[PDB]
Amino acid sequence: MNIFEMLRIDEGLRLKIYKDTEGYYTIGIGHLLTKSPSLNAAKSELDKAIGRNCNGVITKDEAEKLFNQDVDAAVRGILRNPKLKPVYDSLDAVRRCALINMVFQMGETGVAGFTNSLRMLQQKRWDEAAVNLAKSRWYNQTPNRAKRVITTFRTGTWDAYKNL
Numbered sequence: 170m171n172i173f174e175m176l177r178i179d180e181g182l183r184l185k186i187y188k189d190t191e192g193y194y195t196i197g198i199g200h201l202l203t204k205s206p207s208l209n210a211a212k213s214e215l216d217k218a219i220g221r222n223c224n225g226v227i228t229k230d231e232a233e234k235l236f237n238q239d240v241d242a243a244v245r246g247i248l249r250n251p252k253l254k255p256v257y258d259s260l261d262a263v264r265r266c267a268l269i270n271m272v273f274q275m276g277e278t279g280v281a282g283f284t285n286s287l288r289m290l291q292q293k294r295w296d297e298a299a300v301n302l303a304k305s306r307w308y309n310q311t312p313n314r315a316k317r318v319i320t321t322f323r324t325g326t327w328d329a330y331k332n333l
Contacts, residue, residue, distance in 0.1 A: 197232035267321040
């Protein structure tokens with residue numbers, strides 16, 4: 170299993186504009202288009218992103234290209250972030266995937282706000298960090314996905330996804 174397969178399980182694939190769990194306009198593999206309420210603002214961002222008139226719809230290929238960009242940007246974002254980089258560098262390969270997943274869902278800024286949990290991961294206190302991570306709006310709002318990520322940090326294995 171790898172970061173791409175992981176995220177593909179968590180976000181799904183939709184070729185028509187849709188609303189995400191938070192009500193925002195998204196497309197493809199969890200690609201946020203805008204937090205704006207206008208479907209029109211969404212269709213415009215979409216065409217801007219693809220470089221064609223899409224009329225709210227995209228192909229598989231297009232969805233996958235956006236996905237490649239997004240994963241790349243998530244990684245680069247962690248690497249440039251002074252709060253995130255040290256954590257990432259201290260992690261093994263599987264747990265690295267768990268941090269990337271959080272950044273992709275919630276943005277650099279959002280994850281960087283998990284100060285205490287970040288500290289526990291850095292210290293390799295797996296059980297403690299898992300319990301701390303769960304005390305968040307993130308966990309309460311998307312519990313099944315949060316649990317999968319949390320178990321990934323807890324165990325350092327892909328068990329939570331070997332099901333799926």
